[PDB]
């Protein structure tokens, strides 16, 4: 399991934790296979917290998984947000995971609860460190569109 993200700032590579959480990673894998992540804006960027994105609407809402609306999150003990670069999922309830995800920029130990951890960024962390310095308006949203040109899975 391995996905490249051709982002505007640079190149992002992710290795999926299929052995830990298989159900929540296969959707991302086949989703990059389908590749509607083309032209998807990283609508949320917070200095030292996250970079969220993945909704075709671009309005900070929406996003359809392969199951279609949502699914069940699986979390176990050894998973932690101890670093900066853990690739996790975005939800709005108990089991409300959608197609959109986010990348961690600082240890968020308080967040190892309702959020599924299914990735680690091996290469391109400098791209995320630069994304942490992107011009952002009053709300947590970049002023210029931070589109993903392509997402090729390998």
């Amino acid at each position: 399991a391995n996905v490249e993200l051709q982002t505007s700032l640079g190149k992002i590579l992710i290795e999926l934790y299929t052995e830990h959480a298989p159900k929540t990673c296969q959707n991302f894998y086949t989703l990059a296979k389908e590749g509607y992540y083309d032209g998807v804006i990283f609508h949320r960027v917070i200095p030292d917290f996250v970079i969220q994105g993945g909704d075709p609407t671009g309005t900070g809402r929406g996003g359809t998984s392969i199951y279609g609306d949502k699914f069940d999150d699986e979390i176990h003990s050894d998973l932690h947000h101890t670093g900066a670069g853990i690739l996790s999922m975005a939800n709005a309830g108990p089991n409300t995971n959608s197609s959109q995800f986010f990348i961690t920029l600082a240890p968020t130990p308080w967040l190892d609860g309702k959020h599924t951890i299914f990735g680690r960024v091996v290469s391109g962390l400098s791209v995320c460190k630069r994304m942490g310095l992107i011009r952002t308006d009053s709300s947590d949203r970049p002023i210029e569109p931070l589109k993903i040109i392509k997402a090729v899975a390998l």
């Binding site: 700032l9 200095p47 310095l133 011009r135 589109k147 040109i149």
Partner: peptide
């Protein structure tokens, strides 16, 4: 860490495979 946007966003790899913009 509080640096905020003190500089222009670094040039983007455009969708036309242009390495830098």
């Amino acid at each position: 860490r509080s640096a905020k946007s003190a500089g222009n966003t670094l040039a983007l790899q455009v969708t036309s495979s242009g390495a830098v913009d």
